[PDB]
Design an enzyme around this catalytic site. Structure first.
Site, short mmCIF file in Angstrom:
data_model
loop_
_atom_site.label_atom_id
_atom_site.label_comp_id
_atom_site.label_asym_id
_atom_site.label_seq_id
_atom_site.Cartn_x
_atom_site.Cartn_y
_atom_site.Cartn_z
N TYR B 129 0.88 -1.15 0.00
CA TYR B 129 0.00 0.00 0.00
C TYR B 129 0.92 1.20 0.00
O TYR B 129 1.53 1.51 1.02
CB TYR B 129 -0.88 -0.07 1.24
N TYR B 131 1.34 5.13 -0.30
CA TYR B 131 0.57 6.36 -0.13
C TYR B 131 1.48 7.45 0.41
O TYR B 131 1.39 7.83 1.58
CB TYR B 131 -0.56 6.10 0.85
N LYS B 153 -1.01 -1.20 -4.40
CA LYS B 153 -2.07 -0.21 -4.39
C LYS B 153 -1.37 1.15 -4.21
O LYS B 153 -0.85 1.44 -3.14
CB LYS B 153 -3.03 -0.52 -3.24
#
Ligand SMILES: [Mg+2]
Ligand SMILES: [Mg+2]
EC number: 4.1.2.55
Lengths: 288, 288, 288, 288
Positions: B129, B131, B153
């Protein structure tokens, strides 16, 4: 001019806090001239500590001194509030929190409402911990004007930002948290809350005492050495390197940080010590 | 072209997770065509959830679907590992974590060692992930090439950044997390992990279905409405606004977010509903 | 979908513009399918060109085509205005300017007043050149709503930013300037103004033609190769590398950039050519 | 502790430099204790000045003083070199340039080659003008160690950055350009190159004189007023506001800046004067 230490949280190898080491360390820091202790700050791995761990740090330190500023921030205000209620029963210097963090693009009003709730319930002096490089938010004086702020700890490389709080919030005490600006903070603010106080407290105390004597050149020469050290530490992880250097400079074991703040390996600890040797030598020459 | 939902975590007014609402919401999303559910992502208030709350979200959702990606990140690797071991005994799509966060200037090797530990123990497919806007770190392919990565992601506004992963990591599935880039992601990546799927799942599924039919202009008209909505949500707090809009668009209550992610007040929710009205009409006119 | 080339300005070794090479290059680009030419853009060393040089570039190109967008920006509005008055007498596509630049912290109204003066005097369609990474300013639609804007060239990595102009300024044509987002721009905007059109025009024209045929996979495969190239060029200076690659790919000499945009040395040119060989091979295989 | 003034360039309403006003202004600054004048710095609209205008500013100031540092930067190294050769025949303190600017992502070697050329030909002391907020590049000591640098003017809000130069470049004089850090610079560096010297030279000289007497509290009270002024000037455009304030504080006209650096309108100038009134009173009360 107040020298505040954001004290490290000693952990053992299994990642459990070692409160005996915490008390030993705190006692030494006070003996070396640290004026107050900031508990569960970034250097103390604050956001990584559970609610119970934050509480137990305060409980352990309270046996050593009551000059404790208790940092309570987390991403669940219910937990923050439980810690505020707990701290209401303790005779301490104040309660503090950094802003909400991680989540991007939170409206400014969320930050205001967060501090407002801490102030509604706290029976202690409110300290603001401002660290935009960590939280992603800067807390402006406009939000603070409506809160009963007593102190602000500003970890910021722009000294004018720290001075602006002084100007806009009359009577509030302001302390800068940058290790590389200590000299300047001691010549303009109410003090410092610098992480290096954990391993070279005598150096920073000496800068303060020298400035009181008007010996600015000597205090600036010490700042030069501190800044050279800071460059070296960054490569290893500053917080993680601090644990190794407390043992080196102060002579007792403070264990390890807890992963994701990885401890230095044996090889890394040895390399760090080789790199800082020349500086350690120059420091010990100017600070007996 | 997969549509993954980073599902919200419903809370009641006391800040306790409402798992009944969570299950109702998940069933609705899946009936409407969502391909998988990302559990404890930013939208689900991940970092704000305790270890037990993260576990309980997975347990509840596991009663509804097998299509789950379990996000387990926290600032204590011991807690992360407990969640990894817990999920090892469950038949889910994979395990995920965002990088260490809050603490600035951590060496890159710390990031590597963090993921290495998760990969050492997990018996599930590893999802990264990424971000940077939230954690302060971008995970570079350098570190990813060494790990058994199955999916990434990427919540990032630079679509070339997400596309780069595809090129450098053969066989890894790549999803972009931005609501404002959905159309583009559906036309170039393995899919999206978009928070707006919580309240307009039918719209995003329709974009995918239209693209599959070669009806790109129609899919782009929907993206335009989505982008207008996104600009409105920002002033209210996007995540907080989502809770209100689930009830408005989907017809059931999902409660509230938990402070510091403050819920919209009754007046803010009214204000939000008025602003979005013309956009809701246009959307419902094109999707029904 | 319009393919606009921000044409390079050929210079000789003494730093004088070579208009013969400029015309040769422009003629080839049009023959290879470029639709229009953006004169004195960043790739054309705009801000580095004197007022007279900017004018002479337009005069030279006017013999080749009238599909010219004339960029006129400089740090003295009197000079900008002289170029606008000059261009009023030419039959061209439009006049353009990037924002004021260099000076930090200029009030937003300065930017508005700057464009307002260009619009007061220009008899041509106004194009806005938005390049925040270069000027330090982003021009918001709010400023543009009061101006007679016909086109916007947005060199920005956030495609949603480019799409927002489309949404907020009805009838305005919007083109994205990023080489790494071409595929996406061709699927959503009015076109592109990408620097790589100088040396691989056939590739970008082929992407456009493929997209018109519905062959998106092939166009995306070409985008992958373009992005890999972009990574390589950055190391040498993208604009400077373009001059070397025009000779390599197109077969004629376009001279050199002018310092501070240093030309590649012979050694550097040779190293660049070795690095791109595999990509050049794959490109020439997919684009005959 | 040297106080250097980056003198403004007076223009008339048609955008032509008024050299009579420039000379009057320079004489006043020098009579009030300014140690040297930095010619064509940001405050003097450097990048906005043509090569001939930069030359003429030096020629005019040369009729008043020998204490001149000549800034010659532009986006064409041939023009820079013409100014270097011109100044070689004049008896001034030194030559200076900021880095290449506007163009993003230039390789570091381009910066090095730029300064190398200036150093190859100049017969004067080399000063580096470091202003990352304006140029987009920070000049690292790596490149500076190779050049015959005599002084560095660092317009930077991080005072540790300026202090670092002192440490790494033995014998080089270092000045900080921030108005909001004057006090700190006077207590740690070789001096300041502060734009506010244009309208309150007596105040900044007084800070220096007070520090020399060990009267730091008094010098800090002046800095506080300076910082309040700086916050007011920002909304108007700091450079543009300076022109108005020279007349207000010093009593003679210095004309206007030149658009895109728009002059304050009659109403803005009135508004500015009202806001600063209480601050002017306090200043004149402490300095007279
Ligand atoms: Mg179950
Ligand atoms: Mg003369």
């Amino acid at each position: 001019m107040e020298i505040i230490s954001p004290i490290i949280t000693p952990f053992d190898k299994q990642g459990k806090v070692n409160v005996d080491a915490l008390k030993t360390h705190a006692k030494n820091l006070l003996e070396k001239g640290i004026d107050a202790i900031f508990v569960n700050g970034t250097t103390g791995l604050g956001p990584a500590l559970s609610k119970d761990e934050k509480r137990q740090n305060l409980n352990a330190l309270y046996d050593v001194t009551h000059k404790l500023i208790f940092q309570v921030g987390s991403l669940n205000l219910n937990d923050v509030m439980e810690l505020v209620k707990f701290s209401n029963e303790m005779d301490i210097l104040g309660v503090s929190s950094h802003s909400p963090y991680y989540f991007p693009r939170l409206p400014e009003k969320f930050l205001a409402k967060y501090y407002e709730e801490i102030a509604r319930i706290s029976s202690h002096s409110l300290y603001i911990y401002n660290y935009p490089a960590a939280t992603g938010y800067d807390i402006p004086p406009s939000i603070l004007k409506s809160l009963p702020v007593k102190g602000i700890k500003d970890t910021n490389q722009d000294l004018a930002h720290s001075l602006e709080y002084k100007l806009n919030l009359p009577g509030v005490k302001v302390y800068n948290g940058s290790n590389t600006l200590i000299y300047y903070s001691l010549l303009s603010l109410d003090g410092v809350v610098a992480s290096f106080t954990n391993f070279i407290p005598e150096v920073i105390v000496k800068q303060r005492d020298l400035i009181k004597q008007g010996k600015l050149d000597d205090a600036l020469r010490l700042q030069e050495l501190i800044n050279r050290l800071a460059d070296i530490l960054r490569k290893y992880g500053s917080i993680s390197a601090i644990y190794v250097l407390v043992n080196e400079f102060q002579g007792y074991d403070v264990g390890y940080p807890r992963p994701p703040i990885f401890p230095l390996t044996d090889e890394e600890a040895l390399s760090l010590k080789r790199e800082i040797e020349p500086l350690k030598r120059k420091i010990q020459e100017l600070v007996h």
